[PDB]
Every structure is written in C-alpha cells, then in structure tokens.
Design a protein around this nucleic acid. Structure first.
Ligand SMILES: Nc1nc2c(ncn2[C@@H]2O[C@H](COP(=O)(O)OP(=O)(O)OP(=O)(O)O)[C@@H](O)[C@H]2OP(=O)(O)OC[C@H]2O[C@@H](n3cnc4c(=O)[nH]cnc43)[C@H](O)[C@@H]2O)c(=O)[nH]1
Ligand SMILES: Nc1nc2c(ncn2[C@@H]2O[C@H](COP(=O)(O)OP(=O)(O)OP(=O)(O)O)[C@@H](O)[C@H]2OP(=O)(O)OC[C@H]2O[C@@H](n3cnc4c(=O)[nH]cnc43)[C@H](O)[C@@H]2O)c(=O)[nH]1
Ligand SMILES: [Mg+2]
Ligand SMILES: [Mg+2]
Ligand SMILES: [Zn+2]
Ligand SMILES: [Zn+2]
Lengths: 348, 356
DNA sequence: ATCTGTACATGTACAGAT
DNA sequence: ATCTGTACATGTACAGAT
DNA sequence: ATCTGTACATGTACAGAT
DNA sequence: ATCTGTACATGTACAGAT
C-alpha cells in the first residue's frame, strides 16, 4: 500500500507528457532535418527513440529523453579492444573521420550546436561536453528543465560480435524464436570510449542494445498477453520504477554513489526477470515481496562484486576496476538500512 | 497409450521427407523460374509454402504439398459478392501485364487461372527428369495440381493468388479472435501483413462466377500453427511440450479414414477440422489445458465440439465470422448427421478406424 | 567503372532418428 | 539426451546490365 | 527518397460498479 | 479500496502517394 502510493507520486501526468513531447519533437525533428542537407557526412541518419520515457518506465516527470541518430555503414570490420567485450575499433562519405569516434562525434556535435544557435522559438542550449560521453545533451526550458541526449550510432547488419554469443539468455523466458529474431536485427556502436587516460580511447566505440532493451520492456512476459487489454497485469515495470527511484534518491544525498547509474538497476532486473520467468511470480498483489526479492538480488550483486552486462556476459559492470569495494559496501549498507526501516527515503 | 501409438503410425519418416522434398522443390523451382521469363503476365510472382506439410501436421506420408504463387497487385478495389464475406470481385482504379484478363474494370479469375494453367502445362511437358503430369482440372478449385511418381505418388497443388497490402476487408474486422490467447500485439501485427485472393472457379452457373475470387489466410494459419501457445516457449527447447498439433493430427486422421470409405463424406475437408480446432484453441487458451498427459481428454473435447458444430449446422470461418462453412446451403443435414453418427460410433467403441 | 536481381551463405527451430 | 535434414529468414557476392 | 494517413499499442484520468 | 469502461494523449510501423 505504501509502495502503491509511492508509484502514484512517481506517475507522470498526461498534461506534462504532452507539453514536454511537443517541444522535444520540434527540436529533434529540426536537428534531424539539418543532418540530411548538403554534403553532411551524416546524411541518411535515422531516428530511434530509446530509454525510460519510450519504455514507459520514466519516473517523476517527463524531463529526460534519449534519442539515437543511427547511420548505416558499409563494410565494417570490428576489432575488440583488449578483451573488454563491449569496446571496439572500427575499420573498413565518412572518409574525413580506423574510424575515429571522437572526430566523428566532434563533427556531429559541431553541426548540432549550429542548428541550435539558429532556433529562435525555444529556450534551448547545448550542455558543455562531458569527456568520454557519446551524447550531445540539449537543455530545454519549457519553462521546466528538460534534458535531451542525442546519441550518434553506427548501425551494422552483420552477425552480432562473438562477445555476445552467450548473452541475452532469454530462452526460458521469452524463448528461442524471440532470441533468434532479436539477433537478426542490426547491432549499434556508440562513441563512448572512456576518458580513462588509460587506452587508445578516442577511437573506441561501445556496443548498444537500446533497441533490444526497448523490445524487452514492451514484450516482457512469458505469456504473450502479459499487461495487454485481454491479459493479466504484472508488476515487473513497477518494481523497476521503485528500484530506479531508490537509487535516484540515494544518489542525490550521497556523493559516494557517483559511480552508480540507472543502467545498473536495468541490468540487474533483466537478470531477475530471467531467473523468475513466470508472470505469476510478478503478480501485482505481491508488489512488496517482488520489490524485496529485487533488493536482495541487487545486494548479492554488490556483495559478490558481480553484475554482468545482459548482452555481453564477460563484461562485469561491478568489477573492481570500475567501482571500488568501498563504494559497493556503502551502497549495500544504505539499501539494507532503507529496506529495514520501511524506506524513509521515499517520504517527501 | 493407444493414441501415442496412433501418432507413431502417423509420424512421417525422414527418408520419405528427404526424397519427396528433393523432387517437389525441383519441379516447383522450375515452374517458378518459367513464370519470371519473357512477357509472362505472372512475372514478379513469389513463392509461399502453405498447408499441412509446412505447418508440421501432415500425417502418414509426405505426399501432398501446397504452394502459393502470389502476385502483388497494387491499387485494387474490392466489391464483396452478395454479403458472403469470403467472395469478391476485383476491379482496378487505373485502366500493364494483367490487361489481357480484364472485362471492363473486372479482373477475371478464370481467364487468369486458364493462362496460369496453360503455362504450367507447357513447362511440365518439358520436364524429362521426373514422371510428372498435370491433373485434370477440378471445378471449384483455384489450384493447378501436379501428380508426381517418385516412384511413390506425390500431389502438388499450385495456387495462384493476388497479394494486397491494404488493410484487410471489413468482413474480417471481428475475425481472428486471438486476444485472450496470442494477444493484441500478435493480432495487430498479423493484420498488417498482406491478404490473398484465390480464384473461386466453380461452375455453379450463378452470375459473376468466372470473375469471383475468395480470401485466403494460409500465411496467417501457418504462423498460428507454429506460434500456437499463450506462453512464448510452448513446444520450444526450453519450454513445455503441448498436444495441440497432436490433437489436430488425430482429428485429421479420423476424417481422412472416414472419407476414404464413405462417399457420403465428400462435402467434408481437412479445413473443417482446422477451423474447428482454431476455435477450440481460442476457447481453451492456456497451454495447461493442452498438457500431453491429457491427450485423450483433449482429443475428446475436440470431437464433442465438432459434433456440436455438425448438429447445430454452425462452423464459422475463423477469419470471416459471417461465413458459415456448415450452412445448409453448403452441406445438407443428411451429410452432417451421417458424419455425426460415425464420429459418435468411433468415440464410443475405442476408435476402431485407427486400427486400419 | 558502378549497379543490381539472383543465387548462395549463414544460422537456427522443429522434429525425426539415434 | 544427442545428432541431423529441412525449411526459412536475412545478409552478402557477383556475372551481367548500365 | 520523403511525407502523410491510419490503426492500435502503451499510457493517464476518472466515474460508477464491485 | 479494486475493477471496468470511456475519454483523451502519445508513440510507432507501414502503405500509398509524391
Ligand atoms: N544506456 C546506457 N547507459 C549506460 C551504459 N553503461 C553505463 N550507462 C550509464 O547509465 C545511465 C543511463 O542513462 P539513460 O540511458 O538515460 O537511462 P534510461 O533512459 O534507461 O533511464 P533514466 O535513468 O530514467 O534516464 C547513464 O548515466 C549512462 O552513462 P554513459 O556515460 O554510458 O552515457 C551517458 C548518456 O549517454 C547516453 N547513452 C550512452 N550509451 C547509450 C546507448 O547505448 N544508447 C542510448 N543512449 C546511450 C544516455 O542518454 C546516457 O544518459 C550502457 O551500456 N547503456
Ligand atoms: N486451404 C483451404 N482449403 C479449403 C478452404 N475451403 C475449403 N477448402 C478445402 O479443404 C481442403 C484443404 O486441403 P489442403 O489445403 O491441402 O489442406 P492442409 O494442407 O491444411 O491439409 P491436408 O489435408 O493434410 O493436405 C481442400 O479439399 C479444399 O478444397 P478446394 O476445392 O477449395 O481446394 C482444393 C485445393 O486447393 C488448394 N487451396 C484451396 N484454397 C486454398 C487457400 O485459401 N490457400 C491455399 N491453397 C488453397 C489446396 O491445396 C487444396 O488442397 C479454404 O478456405 N482454405
Ligand atoms: Mg535517460
Ligand atoms: Mg495439404
Ligand atoms: Zn506484464
Ligand atoms: Zn505447444
């Protein structure tokens, strides 16, 4: 009952959705049209909306939108960057960019900045570049603050890279036919490299499966009718929302949690959903115990320093090399505390 | 256990499948290549394998194959033939290969089928690899049927079809009631696929006879057979096996056996049982209602359903609800009562006809 | 040279054979 | 419980056409 | 190669019935 | 409270026209 009323607080308003979307769509459509003109290197780039808003798991307000501008590329040969699983060099129009991620992103970013400078009807600027990040982030004032991440992506139609062979373990949940069809879709590379100061970073791209993650969110049941008008509602997305909120709230309060992000929770729950495939293990009447079992799972991930990327099994998002034990133990104690005192942090 | 051993008898052999398929594919590929040549009116025609063999419900032997040669026909206007739901006249916006088959604005099914049949007969005459002839035309059929002797007798039905990409005709709006079984997303996607029209080609002697076409949903029926569970993993390597297809096979066999022996059953076909079981699968959507351990009771409940359909003279086409396949006007009561008694008899005496 | 319709290459589910 | 033939969807190479 | 129109899924909102 | 039915809103795939 507490959790139901938290979800009520978290629920977006139809009026807010409508206002935010109309502005975001104006800006996005204009940026997309600009990419098609002239001898733009990105002519042919196509739109693909990703992330929480388009998966219907956005919480609190419609203030963060993620959009991929994907470009199909001819005869690309990938080379995995030192057995990381997720990172690659790309070799073989785009001639004036080994295809450099940073050079390509810089040009993309330059174009966007120009078009935004010409927008006179919307209060919209381009956020200062964050090193390593693949995104060009727009800040809109509607007058409410809305952030739009525009992610350049390469689209490849070939077989998925071998690092993913054993990934997407949906065979007992969504099934072999679903999995085979999903893997016949393209895969994407995004200009996230790392700003480590460590490796050949400026030329590195990262695999993206946002298209696949979107499909799963919207086709998330073992029964074909899960959450449809002639099926039974489950509480899978509601558990995701609650876990997203716990992390958001904790991150606002504690700088110690800077290394943690929403993708950690998304990844964790994909694993939970695989482990508990039955729709009846996610009955709405069991929201508390479902949300609880998710926390326990997340805690086991933290304690064993083990959270494998859902698509790239060898890539541990909770490896020592990415997040120190100190930070995992800190988050562990905080989650345990909220869990054992009726989630005080939910109370605003 | 009895039924398991019947299904063992019914199961196709890999050796038989391999030999039959090699020959069927040769012939079909050659016929298809001939359609692409010259100023063939059927240039652009594409293949689509349909029916029991490609749905994995063919029984006893791999001796009957059904293949659709579909031709995309843009900017087509349909007119429903006397509120039948299934039958249509096909006209064109524009007044073009098909010009040769027009009658004013109206695309003649029989003229188009005749030409299709003429071409096929020629190509078959040129085949010296295998013993293959073209079966005498059956009135009331859209098919050109090949008889192959590979030594064994194999039949191939080649069905001419128009493909239309528009929304499905309104007679189907309330059809395909899969919302509680396969769901709304599946249903919406299925109805975005094309629909097909095949020649009626009856010699009934009613008006517009030779120009009449019938809707086909074999593509949709194939998808359903191979994606037949409420659970995505039904019958998959990481799921639970069901007995849905096994029930279909048993029902198919009962009708086949009865049809061999009794001429009274000439009006009945396998599509009647397919239709009946689509309704049963909708009525009992849960995979657990089709547990393998319950094969007998599952097969029994299907017979009861089929019997109710016969006795009340009511079996609605699954895609076109207003079209009753068991109407008086299609099959007389005499025939329905005959089949009724025969099914009841087998049901109540341990299926003697399975032992033949 | 560049483009393209056709044929082949690759991968896997399904179900039969072991 | 594993192995294997067919069907089928999608990607890619290429002789012939431009 | 681009744009619009259509259909319907995924949502929110809320009244009346349970 | 919860469920059902209707209204109102957006997102998304794809056919047909340009
Ligand atoms: N998507 C994604 N994020 C990852 C990955 N590895 C680490 N991250 C970090 O997790 C956060 C996810 O933010 P969002 O993608 O906006 O999340 P949702 O929309 O699902 O949900 P909300 O939390 O409600 O918004 C980020 O902090 C991200 O950090 P980062 O440095 O990797 O990227 C920064 C932003 O870049 C965009 N982005 C990055 N990768 C992708 C991608 O593959 N597709 C689309 N956008 C991407 C994104 O907008 C980030 O905010 C990881 O593998 N995937
Ligand atoms: N498919 C189909 N058949 C129908 C329809 N209305 C009546 N029928 C009659 O049912 C029989 C079906 O035989 P098959 O199509 O081979 O069945 P399966 O493959 O599912 O199963 P098996 O029994 O194991 O082979 C026929 O007797 C048919 O009679 P008909 O005179 O109308 O047609 C004879 C053949 O024509 C082909 N055909 C007819 N309609 C279609 C269609 O819509 N699509 C594809 N082929 C079709 C078929 O090869 C027949 O044997 C009805 O609506 N559909
Ligand atoms: Mg986001
Ligand atoms: Mg057949
Ligand atoms: Zn659900
Ligand atoms: Zn099944």
């Amino acid at each position: 009952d507490k959790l139901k009323k938290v979800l009520d607080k978290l629920r977006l308003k139809r009026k807010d959705i409508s206002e935010a979307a109309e502005t975001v769509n104006k800006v996005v459509e204009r940026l997309l049209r600009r990419m098609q003109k002239r001898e733009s290197e990105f002519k042919g780039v196509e739109q693909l909306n990703t992330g929480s808003y388009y998966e219907h798991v956005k919480i609190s307000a419609p203030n963060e939108f993620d959009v991929m501008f994907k470009l199909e590329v001819p005869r690309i040969e990938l080379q995995e960057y030192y057995e990381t699983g997720a990172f690659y060099l790309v070799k073989f129009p785009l001639s004036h960019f080994v295809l450099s991620a940073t050079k390509m992103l810089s040009k993309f970013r330059k174009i966007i900045k120009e078009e935004v400078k010409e927008i006179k009807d919307i209060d919209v600027s381009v956020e200062k570049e964050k090193p390593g990040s693949p995104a060009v982030t727009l800040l809109i004032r509607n007058p409410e603050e809305i952030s739009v991440d525009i992610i350049l992506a390469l689209e490849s139609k070939g077989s998925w890279p071998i690092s993913t062979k054993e990934g997407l373990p949906i065979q007992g949940w969504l099934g072999t036919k679903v999995r085979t069809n999903l893997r016949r879709e393209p895969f994407y590379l995004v200009p996230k490299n790392a700003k480590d100061g460590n490796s050949f970073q400026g030329e590195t791209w990262r695999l993206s499966f946002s298209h696949t993650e979107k499909y799963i969110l919207n086709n998330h049941g073992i029964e074909k009718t899960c959450c449809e008008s002639s099926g039974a509602k489950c509480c899978r997305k509601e558990c995701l929302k609650l876990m997203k909120y716990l992390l958001e709230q904790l991150k606002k309060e504690f700088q110690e949690l800077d290394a943690f992000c929403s993708y950690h929770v998304k990844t964790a729950i994909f694993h939970m959903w695989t482990q508990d495939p039955q729709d009846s293990q996610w009955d709405p009447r069991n929201l508390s115990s479902c949300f609880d079992k998710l926390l326990a799972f997340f805690l086991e991930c933290l304690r064993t320093e083990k959270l494998d990327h859902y698509f790239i099994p060898k890539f541990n998002l909770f490896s020592q090399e990415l997040i120190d034990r100190k930070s995992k133990e800190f988050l562990s104690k905080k989650i345990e505390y909220e869990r054992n005192n009726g989630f005080p942090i939910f109370d605003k």
